[PDB]
């Protein structure tokens, strides 16, 4: 059966550069066109290269023309997207598709390569207290996990013994390059006094650990 | 050359039928052939309608495509919708070494009832003030379907930058969160006499606000 399966990719800095790969199998390689479709994170399908089977007319957008490059490679049956001088905008998950120009669409989709364009490098993040407030009788606090990068943080409440009403929010990419996220947990308000929370936050990519007590105000 | 444009989001419900259009800016629809795609968060694409209104293999028969002049648009019809419908379907078009794709419409499923956001709001901690650093949040929780707009205000008046807002995350319970935070300066922030955070779900807006201690 028909199998693409992308390579290549990964973070980069502004005016870098990468080469993504796509090796096909399951099928004679040389009788289709070959294509690249990325979707930027909260976009829709963006169309940016099309090359022939045979390597004979390349079509390209205006947004991407002069700075990607689609070839290929009938003895490895790979498909290449050279992208040069890349953008923070050019951030997007690639996929690797497999044309019937005959009919005008796209039958085979890859399983596609993500690619991150930021200026940022490892940093770990600056945990602070976020001290509760109502929901009365149910209150919410947490912990604001600020400025890190890259994805993941993890984070736990009293060493994972406190689970109940913990929701950790996805974070949100800062356009200053770095993430931020909080991490909250609802409560029984009467346990303010006598009970003790303490985020444990967890950020592997710069081997960092922060635990910060949320005490109340 | 053209642009095709489809609705942002629509919802239904189980059992249910649903017509998702794909009108073309110029020209005649029926000039190249139209092609849907449905799309899920992680996930690869797969092709749900080719060559104007042919299925391939194991797509199931629910899904139908069509076109529609009068209009200038197509069609990708879903009868007895499932659960497992609610996705992200694109309709696609070629003409003249150019692939055009629609911006894609958010199939909602609703399979439970409206919920009215829980909205929580934290002023910058103490912490954070000494820092030379002051950030608001706000928390957005147990609101279905799952798409809200935030709108922050600095006394009364709107606040043009320093917002980001993260996209609707779908929650444990099926219901959806999301949360959003205000950049400011120390100064900023104790100038004001409060800050506030407006959140927008199904046209009906909650809203919280918070003081400098």
């Known amino acids: 059966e028909v199998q693409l399966v992308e390579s290549g990719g990964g973070l980069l800095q502004p005016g870098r550069s990468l080469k993504l790969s796509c090796v096909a199998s399951?099928?004679?390689?040389?009788?289709?066109?070959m294509s690249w479709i990325r979707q930027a994170p909260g976009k829709g399908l963006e169309w940016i290269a099309s090359?022939?089977?045979?390597?004979?007319?390349?079509y390209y957008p205006d947004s991407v023309k002069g700075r990607f490059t689609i070839s290929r490679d009938s003895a490895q049956n790979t498909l290449y997207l050279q992208m040069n001088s890349l953008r923070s905008e050019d951030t997007a998950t690639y996929y690797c598709?497999?044309?019937?120009?005959?009919?005008?669409?796209?039958?085979?989709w890859g399983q596609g390569t993500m690619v991150t364009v930021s200026s940022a490098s490892t940093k770990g993040p600056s945990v602070f207290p976020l001290a509760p407030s109502s929901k009365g009788g149910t209150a919410a606090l947490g912990c604001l996990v600020k400025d890190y990068f890259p994805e993941p943080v993890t984070v736990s409440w009293n060493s994972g013994a406190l689970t109940s009403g913990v929701h950790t929010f996805p974070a949100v990419l800062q356009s200053s390059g770095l993430y931020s996220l909080s991490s909250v947990v609802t409560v029984p308000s009467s346990s303010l006094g006598t009970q003790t929370y303490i985020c444990n936050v967890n950020h592997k990519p710069s081997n960092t650990k922060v635990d910060k007590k949320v005490e109340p105000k | 050359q053209f642009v095709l444009s489809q609705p942002n989001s629509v919802s239904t419900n189980l059992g249910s039928t649903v017509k998702l259009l794909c009108k073309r800016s110029?020209?005649?629809?029926?000039?190249?052939?139209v092609s849907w795609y449905q799309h899920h968060e992680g996930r690869s694409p797969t092709t749900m309608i080719y060559?104007?209104?042919?299925?391939p293999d194991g797509v199931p028969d629910r899904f139908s495509g069509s076109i529609d002049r009068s209009s200038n648009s197509a069609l990708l019809t879903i009868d007895n919708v499932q659960t497992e419908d609610e996705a992200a379907y694109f309709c696609?078009?070629?003409?003249?070494?150019?692939?055009?794709f629609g911006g894609g419409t958010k199939l909602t499923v609703l399979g439970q009832p409206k919920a009215a956001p829980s909205v929580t709001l934290f002023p910058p901690s103490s912490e954070e003030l000494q820092a030379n650093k002051a950030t608001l949040v706000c928390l957005i929780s147990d609101f279905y379907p799952g798409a809200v707009t935030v709108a922050w205000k600095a006394d009364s008046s709107p606040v043009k930058a320093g917002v980001e807002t993260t996209t609707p995350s779908k929650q444990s319970n099926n219901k959806y969160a999301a949360s959003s935070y205000l950049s400011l300066t120390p100064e900023q922030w104790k100038s004001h006499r409060s800050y506030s955070c407006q959140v927008t779900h199904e046209g009906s807006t909650v809203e919280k606000t918070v003081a400098p201690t």
């Open positions: 696609h078009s070629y003409s003249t070494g150019m692939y055009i």
């Open positions: 060559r104007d209104d042919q299925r």
């Open positions: 110029t020209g005649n629809i029926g000039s190249n052939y």
């Open positions: 090359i022939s089977n045979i390597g004979g007319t390349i």
């Open positions: 399951g099928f004679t390689f040389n009788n289709y066109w």
């Open positions: 598709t497999r044309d019937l120009r005959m009919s005008d669409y796209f039958d085979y």
